[PDB]
Design a protein around this ligand. Structure first.
Ligand code: NI
Ligand code: NI
Ligand code: NI
Lengths: 76, 39
């Protein structure tokens, strides 16, 4: 299925995923496209910061959903 | 060169989508507001 990842500017990244994919797997697909390490990626859905050990279906993230991406600032 | 992290992580203030900033948790919002004031 298709989901969208969207930064502070509204820049949108299209991803092909499955509901069984973990959040770490999503951040790995994001690294393949954007070149940002997954530890520096923070993904947000329904106002909550997502945990890497859980899956998309664990957060009820369905097709055509939008995740928001906020990178970590230096030091943090 | 270490300055490259925040060049990507913190886009210019005028380029922030208000609907995206609003979708973030409150702690993330405060962290970003504080970082923009230190620019
Ligand atoms: Ni980018
Ligand atoms: Ni992780
Ligand atoms: Ni917008």
């Amino acid at each position: 299925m298709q989901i969208f990842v969207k930064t502070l500017t509204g820049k949108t990244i299209t991803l092909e995923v499955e509901p069984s994919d973990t959040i770490e797997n999503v951040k790995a697909k994001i690294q393949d496209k954007e070149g940002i390490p997954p530890d520096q990626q923070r993904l947000i859905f329904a106002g909550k910061q997502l945990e890497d050990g859980r899956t998309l279906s664990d957060y009820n993230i369905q097709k055509e959903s939008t995740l928001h991406l906020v990178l970590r600032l230096r030091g943090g | 060169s270490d300055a490259g992290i925040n060049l990507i992580a913190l886009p210019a203030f005028s380029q922030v989508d208000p609907e995206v900033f609003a979708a973030l948790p409150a702690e993330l919002q405060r962290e970003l507001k504080a970082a923009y004031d230190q620019r």
